[PDB]
Amino acid sequence: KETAAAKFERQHMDSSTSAASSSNYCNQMMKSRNLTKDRCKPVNTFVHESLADVQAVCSQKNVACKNGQTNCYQSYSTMSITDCRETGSSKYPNCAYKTTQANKHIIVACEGNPYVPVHFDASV
């Protein structure tokens, strides 16, 4: 059993780097975080900020999640992120990813006690 909070950390947190170091980052990271197990995850965003700063977003700007729920939150500042996106030649089990580094606001859903991110909704 992986809780939503822990799954969020596995799938979306990379506090140990400040940005993607190479164009091969996503290939490495999608593999190591188990996002290429059973299927290639089509798109995935990793956040290069401390866990603490990502958790603080839960008490920042309240917005609607894409699915219409009200417990989503947008970070006040932009954050260092990496967008990983399947290329057109990616085909399980030989997944392949384009790496795009950016600085964007993140949007997460928060839930539980403590009130922590449980879902990556978007970047803007």
Partner 1 sequence: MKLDIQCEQLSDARWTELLPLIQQYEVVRLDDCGLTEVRCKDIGSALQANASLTELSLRTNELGDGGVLLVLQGLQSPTCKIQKLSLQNCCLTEAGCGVLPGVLRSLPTLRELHLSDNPLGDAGLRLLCEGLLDRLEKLQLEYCSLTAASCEPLAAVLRATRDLKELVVSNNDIGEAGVQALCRGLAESACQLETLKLENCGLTAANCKDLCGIVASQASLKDLDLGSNRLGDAGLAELCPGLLSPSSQLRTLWLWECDLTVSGCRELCRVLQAKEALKELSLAGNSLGDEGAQLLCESLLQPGCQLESLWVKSCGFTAACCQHFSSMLTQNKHLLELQLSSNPLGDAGVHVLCQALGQPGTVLRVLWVGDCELTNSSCGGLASLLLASPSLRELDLSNNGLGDPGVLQLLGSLEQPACSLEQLVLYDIYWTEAVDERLRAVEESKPGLRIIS
Catalytic residue among 12, 33, 48, 105: 12
Catalytic residue (choose from 33, 48, 105, 119): 119
Instruction: Assign 50 to helix, strand or coil.
Output: coil
12 is catalytic: yes
Is 99 annotated in some ligand binding site? no
Q: Residue written as tokens 């939503």?
A: 4
Structure tokens at 63: 């917005």
Name which position in 42, 51, 78, 124 contacts partner 1 (CB under 8 A). 42
Interface segment toward partner 1; rule CB under 8 A; list 13-21, 24-32, 54-62, 73-81: 24-32
Catalytic annotation on 48? no
Task: Tell me if 10 is assigned to a ligand binding site.
Answer: yes
> Residues forming the annotated binding site for substrate?
7, 10, 41-45, 66, 85
